[PDB]
Amino acid sequence: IVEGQDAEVGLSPWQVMLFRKSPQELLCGASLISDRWVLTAAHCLLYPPWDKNFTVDDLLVRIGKHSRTRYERKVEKISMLDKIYIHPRYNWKENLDRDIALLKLKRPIELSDYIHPVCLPDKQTAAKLLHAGFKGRVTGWGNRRETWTTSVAEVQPSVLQVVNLPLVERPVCKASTRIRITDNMFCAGYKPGEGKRGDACEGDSGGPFVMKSPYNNRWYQMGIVSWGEGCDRDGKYGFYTHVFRLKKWIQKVID
Amino acid sequence: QRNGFCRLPADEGICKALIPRFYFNTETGKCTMFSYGGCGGNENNFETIEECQKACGAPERVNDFESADFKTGCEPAADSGSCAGQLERWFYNVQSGECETFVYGGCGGNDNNYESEEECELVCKNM
Amino acid sequence: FQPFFNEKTFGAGEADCGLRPLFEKKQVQDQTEKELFESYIEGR
Ligand code: NA
């Protein structure tokens, strides 16, 4: 997360770290949607240009985390996956269209102060909340700047990072990129001259873009960190998987 | 992953120069040389192969994740405690080098006591 | 609010979703959620 801040403890109790157990690394962010199911980006699991096709044997999820690196004994939960479900129409070749994956936990996890599921939007929530200018929230353990001069070490957060970003209208998203945008995407970020900055970056992918409803006080996951063009560049915006548009697929997989 | 321009095709543009540049080829997964005409094209266009790899190849990522304190969290032998519960727990066995099951009472014991094999292996079978 | 998924396959948690134990559950607002609500006045 670029131009964000350290998240408070328990700020984002649905936040999930997708973790590689071999060369121990943060692969991606994710989110807890029940005691059993985790939502992430398809490209976190499957990307043929990098020879990437992660199985349940390759991965762990770490839930309830604050520190990126500390083993948070008795607060974080570490668990294996039962199954992986990638959208069958995921367009990895062109534009990451339908960048969505469902992760079934091997065992249901117990909820706590630090572990709690996010809501998925219904039709009315999506209609009321998806307005240009309205701000959502992005969280992750990814890079704090796009580039470094000596080492990727200088851009690592010690704890979970948070940034709030305004939704952007279609025409502005379209003109910012040479890549083709679909209704399975929306973009977010400040415009040049708005005087504010912030973006997701490498390592934040798969993480949640959430909005707090003024109607019922609940947090809803509206998007998944999908792609961008660098991190926090002027005239550019982050793109997010439009979760409500892909809700029919989520229900089909879970049912 | 994130960088969308990496999935754009190589674009020479309409200008007539032969400038050696690099682009990420998604079919091969390799940063590949092409001739750039000197005007237009797209962001899948790098002066060096290193610049391309940094922008478009699999990234350099830290492995600075902490494991359990070995002395207190992994070395001690399994301890059931004082209670009479029958909870299946995992402990790192220094002799065998494996995380193994033991029966835990629910109270007392030591830090070498984990709820899954995979948590134990994560925090004990690393440095 | 009313839950959308079937609990038998979804598991538990949907009924209480999106309400954070350390924030909404104790009526404590977080550092920047005011910014989010302010955007509702400002936005379309
Ligand atoms: Na930007």
Author numbering:
A (entry chain B): 16 to 36, 36A, 37 to 60, 60A, 60B, 60C, 60D, 60E, ...
B (entry chain E): 16 to 142
C (entry chain A): 1P, 1O, 1N, 1M, 1L, 1K, 1J, 1I, ...
Give me lines lifted from the publication on this model.
Thrombin (E.C. 3.4.21.5), as the ultimate proteinase of the coagulation cascade, represents an attractive and perhaps obligatory target for these animals.
By contrast to the major rearrangements of loops surrounding the active site centre observed in the (E192Q)thrombin·BPTI complex, the structure of thrombin is virtually unaltered upon boophilin binding. The experimental electron-density map unambiguously shows that the N-terminal residues of boophilin bind across thrombin's active site cleft in a parallel, hirudin-like manner. The most relevant feature of active site interactions is the occupancy of thrombin's S1 subsite by the ideally suited side chain of BR17. The guanidinium group of this boophilin residue forms two hydrogen bonds with the carboxyl group of TD189 (3.4 and 3.6 Å) at the bottom of the S1 pocket. The only other major contact between the proteinase moiety and the N-terminal domain of boophilin is the parallel stacking of the side-chain of BF39 with those of TP60C and TW60D. The C-terminal domain of boophilin engages in both hydrophobic and electrostatic interactions with thrombin's exosite I. In contrast to the thrombin·ornithodorin complex, however, where direct interactions between side chains of the proteinase and the inhibitor dominate at this interface, in the boophilin complex the equivalent residues are mostly involved in water-mediated interactions.
